[PDB]
């Protein structure tokens, strides 16, 4: 019994080591491991016979539809097309912004103007809204 | 208990430069895009551009790209146009306006300032 | 932009008496079914007030007296008590594209 015993813990403590380089060391981007809101800091404590793990997370609610759009182009010029970075690209529902299309983070909403800062240059696609006007990235 | 209050009318002469302002009252100043609206018949009301306080950007109606500009004051809650080169074609009602969202993605003109004149 | 055109130019319709105004669209003004449609009224010696919006036929500031209708090109407001104090200029307006125009709207009378 004790050698069975003694096998299983030693496969556990293997374990507690991965976590340690991970989770502990890191913040983690493979969901799975630790508490189920993606991850941020985690830490750890002793306890009888093995390591206690608490692991911070964050947790979304209050979930809201929007209109989204896969990328945004120049009607006047097809070859200049961005898509957002980290963020997507939704009709503006703000007062604040005069902009038709404004940016939101992944994991929280709140729409600022597009800007360089947020977006990178892509290949042009069929989906991507045709602008006819005004877009700051590129200004022409 | 919102206000738009605005600056008085007056006959000014052509080829004058002309400045108009528009003061924000009970909220606050900066969450909300300015709208303005030129007036020559009760048949004849046509948008001029919009103004964004809080970051400054603009759009504007094609025919005033080049006699158009728009301003803000934050600390006097306040906002001004500005309009080149006037002409006796330019005589018109003018109406400052703030934005709003009553149904999910509509811009909506909301309150209304009481308008001021130009001529 | 979309040319909003509205009829009848103006009309005369007893106190209290159901009245309606046809308003077209050169073009669709839906864009992902948002429709983008919004209602003013106007009288002198003051300016215009915000009505309706598309789905909205009480709220913006009115009562549920006066409901818009419609898709696609075709509007429409209706009211069935009229009173006198709602004569006024009305005007269709777009705003769903820069330079976001607008009707230059019909005016409703009492007989």
């Known amino acids: 019994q004790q050698l069975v015993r003694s096998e299983s813990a030693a496969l556990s403590a293997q374990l507690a080591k991965d976590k340690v380089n991970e989770c502990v060391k890191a913040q983690s981007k493979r969901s799975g491991f630790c508490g189920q809101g993606t991850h941020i800091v985690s830490f750890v404590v002793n306890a009888p016979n093995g390591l206690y793990f608490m692991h911070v997370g964050y947790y979304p609610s209050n979930h809201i539809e929007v209109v989204s759009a896969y990328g945004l182009c120049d009607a006047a010029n097809p070859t200049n097309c961005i898509a957002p970075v980290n963020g997507y690209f939704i009709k503006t529902n703000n007062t604040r912004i005069v902009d038709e299309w404004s940016y939101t983070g992944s994991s929280f909403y709140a729409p600022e103007p597009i800007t360089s800062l947020n977006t990178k240059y892509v290949a042009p696609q069929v989906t991507y809204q045709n602008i006819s006007t005004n877009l700051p990235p590129p200004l022409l | 208990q919102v206000q738009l209050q605005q600056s008085g009318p007056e006959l000014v002469r052509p080829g004058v430069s002309v400045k108009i302002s528009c003061k924000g009252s009970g909220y606050t100043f900066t969450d909300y895009a300015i709208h303005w609206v030129k007036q020559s018949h009760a048949k004849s009301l046509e948008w001029i551009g919009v103004?964004?306080?809080?970051?400054?950007?603009?759009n504007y109606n094609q025919k005033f790209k080049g006699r158009a500009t728009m301003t803000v004051d934050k600390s006097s809650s306040t906002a001004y146009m500005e309009l080149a080169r006037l002409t006796s074609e330019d005589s018109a009602i003018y109406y400052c306006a703030r934005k709003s969202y009553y149904v999910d993605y509509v811009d909506a003109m909301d309150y209304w300032g009481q308008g001021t004149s130009v001529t | 932009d979309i040319v909003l055109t509205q009829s009848p130019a103006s009309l005369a319709v007893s106190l209290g008496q159901r009245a309606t105004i046809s308003c077209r669209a050169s073009?669709?003004?839906?864009?992902?079914?948002?429709?983008?449609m919004n209602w003013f009224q106007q009288k002198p010696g003051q300016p215009p007030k915000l009505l309706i919006s598309?789905?909205?036929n009480q709220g913006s500031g009115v009562p549920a007296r006066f409901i818009g209708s419609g898709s696609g090109t075709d509007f429409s407001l209706n009211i069935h008590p009229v009173e006198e104090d709602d004569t006024a200029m009305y005007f269709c307006q777009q705003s769903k594209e820069v330079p976001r125009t607008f009707g230059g709207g019909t005016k409703l009378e009492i007989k």
């Open positions: 103004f964004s306080t809080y970051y400054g950007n603009t």
């Open positions: 073009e669709s003004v839906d864009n992902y079914g948002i429709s983008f």
């Open positions: 598309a789905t909205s």
